[PDB]
């Protein structure tokens, strides 16, 4: 775990941002359908 290792808020943001995977053409459609 990389927790407690850096000070950069850019690295912290990219780190927590990359834990969500991209959607397919079909993933956007049923998320929009859920909305």
């Amino acid at each position: 775990s990389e927790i407690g290792r850096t000070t950069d808020p850019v690295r912290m943001y990219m780190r927590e941002m990359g834990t969500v995977e991209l959607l397919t053409r079909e993933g956007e459609i049923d998320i929009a359908k859920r909305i």
Binding site: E2, R5, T6, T7, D8, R11, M12, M14, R15, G18
Partner: protein, 1340 residues
């Protein structure tokens, strides 16, 4: 000899013959920049290398590519003088042919759809002038060369400065030209640690596992295997004898015979040698011997398959017993001992946590990018882009050379990137040095330090700009606009212009040119700096980088360095030192083949120089070349010793090889202490050029070289006859021998007249030649500032007496005669530039006008109708130079002054006087006025008359040069017409121009006549368009700053006479300040009534052991004593026979001197011209370390009928009685330094204050206050001066209400203060409260 040097021949006292001429002194700058801008057909140097480094640019696609074809430097818009006048950079447009090549989508070849090839403009490159300077924003600048650490691998240590035990810890450092640093090092427990970019250290085997090496492959790289080939029993073991060198005897060795050495006896060389006499291969070892050894391989069983014992595990009885059930024939084992083969790599494999390549890449990632979760692809690409990518890492050609040379490789060429082999070899060599098989590098060695000059630093910054544009070009090519765009739509010239503009104007090595005198300029251009981008910082530069290293000999001067915080960080190139093709300083040496010293000269670098034994240049050698001695003093290895004459390989080429150009000009430098010689070399280049230049009577012979190799003189390009000489131009009719065919054969030299240097001194050229005088090529035609007949003349020859005079030369003071001031000997012209800038303001435009409010008609007396001062106006401090008014409004009258204007009805001014005035204390003459007007602003009568004068002057100069050149062409035509088919009286019958209509019988004659006619027509139509170019550049508008409507620059010429407080100095570090200017009848005087010019203190001589100022005095009295004799023969009007005889006696004097002046070769007119130039003293050359000996000085004193003691009887001017002892009187060369007391004296009662804190401002330019700093406050606290201190703190500086009350109290005669709180304490309180902190005054 010459025509310029037999005018006045300097008498040379040097005795060693000159084998190598002193080179062109500015070759560093000129060669470096020529390598930058020239068209290199290969891609090695300069702009070509930079373009090929980035091009071809290919997008993240296969569709298109931008490739580079060619480049070209266009003509500069303005030449260098126009650039200096207009305040713009002298630069050339860079036009680069690019080719946008478009590949189509789908082919196995990817062939071209089309190519759009055209020329893009990327930036202007600042051009170097003829003398090694750059004009950048109007001012001349010098790009100082940089002494930086060479790229390569360097092995170093700390010597017991860690771990409190005195243990030396070694390290290796790979430094690329561009890229990341790679450090290996040893910890106090002998583990190897890698460290990338000075970050946290990982174990060095992690970088070995990032490379695909297993622990087995690592162990076979860094070790050699003890084999135990164990038979059925008895533990048979392989052995080579030198593996038991110093071995502890764990067992007695019996093989091929019985025991050699029993227990309790360690193995010495006789045992190894008798054991190899027995040729022993196989030895029976005990079981406890292998317990503790380290296995070198992964031994697994074939019964079960899994690991019995891994690599790098300490073997024991248990594990050997385990493998014995598996029946292994051979078991390998690492050979380690103490002090010859260390365990460090295995002991490092034990400490690292990593077990494979992925874990190593991940640990490197966690070290380089902490807090970022490593994926396999990013962990792989980080390492591969650290050192193994051509675009991110460059161990350059010099770095590859030094890398291979440091690792004892044969080839010096390679890749710019690291490899597995490079890193392994560095680790192996660090391990060698740890094991005593090497030595650490000396990083201050000049084989390890490299010169980086303007043409390389400029190329690096251009490549920086090129990659800044390469990212945008790669980004633009990824877009689908790809079929309609040209390459000049995707090229942005502004980043590339910005990179080179930032380098040339804003670098630390781009320095305002030191332009005091010629010596200042060439010393600045030959300067090396350890500082700068990529170099050292002067604050963290230690004692050892600021040292004189033995390799500095002949390459860097040990004397010329500044005396302040950066000493040994700013160095000066030696006289003969030049730079390698790799950038390393080399120095020339004469080859000594058979004991005969040859005239063959080899330039040796500091690495090569240490291999050979190199004799000194003070070593005597006979006519055939052999040393007259047989035990010579030499430098062999950085040491110096005596050697036999058959051991020497090289010899120094000169005695001045070791010193810089500045220290080469100090006569009797060998008699000066080195501190005072340092000071003298530094002060020679602060000297100010005086009204009349005065050659040194005692020089060294480097004066002509310094004056000519700087561009301050006008030097004859081709030889000829002076056709027209004039204070502003020289016109030479070139000899027919030096003329090209189809040419006028006329050289015109336009002299620089009264322009200001960077230091506000005067630059003025005066012609040396007279009318009709023959000149040769390379002759000095005009003298620059501080040159006298082509010799560098920095000061004046002053008659000094060394004696204490009534305390007026106490403690380095100087007593000057009043005759020195009457004769204007140290009067200097200083030229100030003063600008009045009229801008647009929000209330309206400022107006240059003679109609100024609150200013009488007397103060507008020397302003013309445009409000600008007349040229030639003698002005003084406070005089208005340019009248200007600023529009204001909302005067907000106080009720009292409102009543005041109600009573007397006087209107208030809507404008305020914003005029340009002469600074106070400055009194000069207006010599020049320039008006720069914006486009759209209407030129006043003054700008129009200045421009009319400029247009008439441009037309006049061009028609004058055309008259001269066509006169030359027609002289050549008349000469070629009487050369064959003579028309000698017919030519003067024909009209002048239609000699071009004469068809001549062509053997070769009509060919020459017709190319002369063609040259004449081309000269006429060249004048015709240079006129219109001049006219368009004159009448055009000026590119002023935004907001500026016009600028008026006034130029004041101020003659500064010498006065008490002016710093005067000699060349021997004898500085001083004039204390008194003494009347002539008060000065000491000799038997003949001749007073002394300057009285110097004799007590400054023996403690500051600059004895060369005494010898220079004794020789200067001798030199003058020759002139005093020649002068007499010229006033008695003696025959030329007697003058010729005496001058021949004076030139023949000396002990085996190298020069021979035979005056029998001289005509009587030439002898009389020489004698007229020698009547003010015969000049004398005293080469450094090869100079005049004291016996020769006494012999020349004897020839001039002077006491050989150098000391005469002086009388007191005030009482007429003798000083009780003889006084050393002679002639010393004094210099007036640029520390004039007019520039230093400043006072202030009140003035302007800073914004935030309300304390007085800084300098005398700002009319500022003196810093009453912390130590002065302590000084006042150490007295009981509490009230003095309280008024320093409150009422003189920051108490805003109290200081106006104090002023009013002083004006009312009441010397009392009402002190309040300093305003900076209120600023402090408000700034601590802007933190989260409640700071408060407890007002109880």
């Amino acid at each position: 000899y010459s025509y310029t040097e037999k005018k006045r021949i300097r008498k040379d006292f040097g005795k060693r013959p000159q084998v190598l001429d002193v080179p062109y002194l500015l070759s560093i700058q000129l060669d470096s920049f020529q390598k930058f801008i020239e068209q290199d057909p290969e891609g090695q140097y300069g702009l070509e290398a930079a373009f090929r480094s980035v091009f071809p640019i290919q997008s993240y696609s296969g569709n298109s590519e931008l490739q580079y074809v060619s480049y070209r430097l266009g003509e500069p818009v303005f030449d260098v003088q126009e650039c200096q006048i207009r305040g713009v950079t002298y630069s050339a447009p860079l036009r680069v042919k690019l080719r946008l090549v478009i590949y189509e989508r789908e082919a196995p070849e990817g062939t071209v759809k089309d190519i759009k090839e055209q020329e893009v403009y990327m930036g202007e490159i600042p051009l170097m002038t003829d003398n090694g300077t750059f004009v950048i924003n109007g001012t001349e600048r010098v790009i100082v060369s940089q002494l930086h650490r060479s790229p390569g691998v360097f092995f170093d240590s700390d010597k017991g400065k860690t771990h409190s035990s005195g243990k030396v810890l070694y390290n290796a450092r790979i430094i690329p030209y561009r890229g990341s640093w790679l450090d290996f090092e040893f910890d106090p427990k002998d583990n190897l640690f890698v460290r990338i970019d000075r970050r946290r250290k990982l174990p060095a085997t992690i970088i070995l596992r990032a490379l695909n090496y297993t622990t087995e492959q690592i162990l076979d790289l860094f070790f050699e295997k003890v084999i135990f080939e164990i038979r059925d029993n008895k533990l048979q073991m392989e052995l080579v004898p030198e593996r038991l060198r110093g071995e502890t005897a764990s067992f007695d060795i019996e093989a091929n015979g019985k025991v050699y050495v029993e227990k309790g006896r360690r193995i010495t060389a006789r045992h190894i040698r008798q054991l190899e006499k027995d040729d022993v291969k196989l030895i029976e070892v005990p079981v406890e011997y292998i317990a503790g050894k380290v296995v070198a391989k992964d031994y697994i069983d074939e019964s079960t398959g899994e690991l019995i014992c891994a690599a790098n595990m300490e073997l024991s009885l248990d594990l050997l017993a385990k493998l014995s059930q598996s029946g292994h024939k051979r078991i390998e084992t690492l050979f380690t001992n103490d002090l010859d083969h260390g365990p460090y790599i295995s002991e490092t494999l034990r400490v690292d946590p990593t077990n494979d390549r992925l874990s190593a890449l991940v640990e490197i990632y966690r070290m380089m990018r902490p807090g970022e979760p490593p994926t396999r692809e990013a962990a792989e690409s980080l390492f591969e882009n650290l050192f193994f990518s051509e675009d991110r890492y460059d161990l350059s050609a010099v770095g590859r050379m030094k890398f291979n040379r440091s690792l004892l490789r044969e080839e010096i060429e390679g890749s710019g990137i690291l490899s597995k082999d490079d890193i392994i070899d560095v680790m192996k060599k660090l391990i060698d040095i740890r094991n005593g098989k090497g030595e650490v590098d000396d990083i201050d060695h000049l084989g390890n330090r490299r010169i980086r000059s303007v043409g390389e630093m400029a190329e690096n910054q251009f490549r920086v700009g090129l990659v800044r544009v390469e990212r945008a070009v790669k980004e633009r090519l990824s877009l689908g606009d790809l079929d309609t765009l040209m390459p000049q739509d995707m090229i942005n010239a502004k980043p590339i212009s910005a990179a080179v503009k930032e380098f040339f104007g804003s670098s630390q090595l781009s320095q305002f040119m030191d332009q005091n005198n010629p010596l200042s300029e060439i010393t600045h251009k030959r300067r090396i700096s350890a500082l700068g981008p990529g170099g050292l910082t002067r604050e963290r530069a230690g004692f050892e980088v600021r040292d004189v290293h033995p390799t500095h000999y002949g390459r860097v001067c040990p004397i010329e360095t500044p005396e302040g915080p950066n000493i040994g960080l700013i160095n000066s190139l030696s006289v003969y030192a030049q730079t390698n093709e790799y950038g390393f300083l080399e120095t020339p040496y004469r080859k000594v083949t058979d004991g005969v010293v040859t005239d063959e000269i080899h330039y040796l670098s500091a690495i090569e120089e240490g291999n050979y034994v190199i004799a000194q240049a003070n070593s005597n050698l006979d006519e055939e070349g052999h040393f007259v001695e047989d035990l010579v003093t030499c430098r062999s290895k950085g040491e110096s010793s005596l050697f036999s004459r058959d051991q020497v390989d090289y010899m120094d080429v000169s005695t001045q090889q070791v010193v810089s150009v500045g220290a080469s000009l100090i006569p009797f430098l060998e008699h000066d202490d080195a501190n005072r010689a340092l000071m003298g070399a530094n002060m020679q280049r602060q000297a100010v050029p005086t009204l009349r230049a005065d050659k040194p009577l005692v020089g060294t012979g480097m004066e002509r070289a310094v004056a000519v190799d700087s561009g301050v003189t006008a030097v004859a390009k081709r030889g000829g006859v002076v056709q027209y000489v004039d204070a502003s131009r020289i016109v030479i009719k070139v000899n027919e021998d030096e003329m090209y065919p189809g040419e006028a054969g006329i050289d015109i030299y336009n002299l620089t007249k009264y322009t200001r240097s960077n230091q506000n001194t005067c630059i003025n050229q005066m012609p040396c030649v007279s009318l009709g005088e023959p000149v040769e090529r390379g002759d000095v035609l005009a003298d620059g500032p501080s040159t006298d007949l082509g010799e560098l003349a920095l000061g004046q020859n002053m008659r000094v007496a060394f004696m204490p005079w009534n305390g007026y030369n106490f403690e380095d003071s100087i007593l000057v005669s009043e005759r020195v001031v009457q004769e204007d000997r140290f009067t200097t012209i200083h030229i100030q530039e003063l600008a009045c800038v009229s801008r647009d303001t929000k209330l309206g435009p400022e107006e240059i006008t003679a109609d100024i409010p609150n200013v009488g008609e007397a103060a507008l007396s020397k302003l013309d109708e445009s409000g600008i001062v007349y040229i030639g106006a003698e002005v003084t401090g406070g005089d208005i130079l340019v009248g200007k008014v600023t529009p204001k409004g909302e005067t907000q009258l106080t009720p009292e002054e409102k009543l005041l204007r109600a009573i007397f009805g006087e209107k208030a001014s809507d404008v305020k006087d914003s005029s340009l005035r002469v600074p106070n204390g400055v009194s000069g003459t207006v010599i020049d006025v320039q008006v720069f007007t914006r486009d759209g602003v209407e030129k006043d009568k003054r700008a129009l008359e200045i421009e009319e004068m400029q247009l008439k002057q441009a037309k006049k100069d061009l028609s004058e040069e055309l008259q001269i050149l066509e006169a030359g062409l027609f002289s050549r035509i008349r000469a070629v017409l009487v050369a064959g088919g003579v028309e000698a009286e017919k030519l003067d019958k024909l009209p002048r121009d239609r000699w071009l209509e004469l068809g001549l019988t062509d053997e070769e004659k009509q060919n020459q006549l017709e190319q002369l006619a063609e040259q004449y027509d081309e000269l006429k139509h060249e004048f015709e368009k240079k006129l219109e170019a001049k006219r368009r550049k004159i009448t055009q508008g000026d590119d002023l700053a935004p907001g500026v409507l016009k600028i008026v620059k006034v130029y004041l010429a101020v003659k500064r006479r010498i006065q008490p407080g002016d710093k005067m100095a000699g060349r021997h570090g004898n500085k001083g300040v004039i204390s008194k200017i003494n009347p002539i009848e008060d000065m000491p005087y000799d038997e003949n009534g001749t007073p002394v010019d300057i009285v110097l203190n004799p007590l400054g001589v023996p403690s500051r052991m600059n004895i060369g100022q005494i010898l220079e005095t004794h020789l200067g009295m001798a030199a003058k004593g020759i002139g005093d004799k020649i002068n007499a023969m010229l006033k008695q009007q003696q025959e030329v026979a007697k003058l010729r005889e005496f001058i021949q006696r004076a030139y023949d004097l000396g002990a085996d001197v190298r020069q021979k002046v035979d005056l029998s070769t001289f005509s009587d007119e030439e002898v009389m011209r020489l004698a007229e130039n020698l009547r003010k003293g015969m000049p004398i050359a005293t080469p450094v370390f090869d100079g005049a000996k004291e016996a020769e000085i006494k012999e020349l004193l004897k020839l001039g009928d002077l006491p050989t003691s150098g000391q005469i009887r002086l009388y007191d001017g005030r009482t007429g009685e003798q000083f009780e002892r003889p006084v050393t009187v002679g002639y010393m060369y004094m210099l007036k330094l640029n520390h004039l007391v007019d520039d230093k004296m400043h006072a202030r009662s009140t003035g302007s204050y800073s914004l935030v804190t309300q304390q007085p401002l800084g300098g005398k330019a700002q009319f500022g206050g003196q810093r009453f700093g912390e130590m002065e406050v302590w000084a006042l606290e150490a007295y009981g001066a509490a009230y003095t201190l309280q008024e320093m703190l409150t009422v003189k500086s920051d108490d805003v209400n109290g200081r106006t009350k104090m002023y009013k109290n002083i004006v009312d005669g009441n010397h009392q203060m009402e002190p309040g709180m300093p305003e900076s304490f209120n600023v402090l309180l408000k700034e601590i409260r802007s933190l989260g902190i409640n700071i408060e005054l407890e007002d109880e």
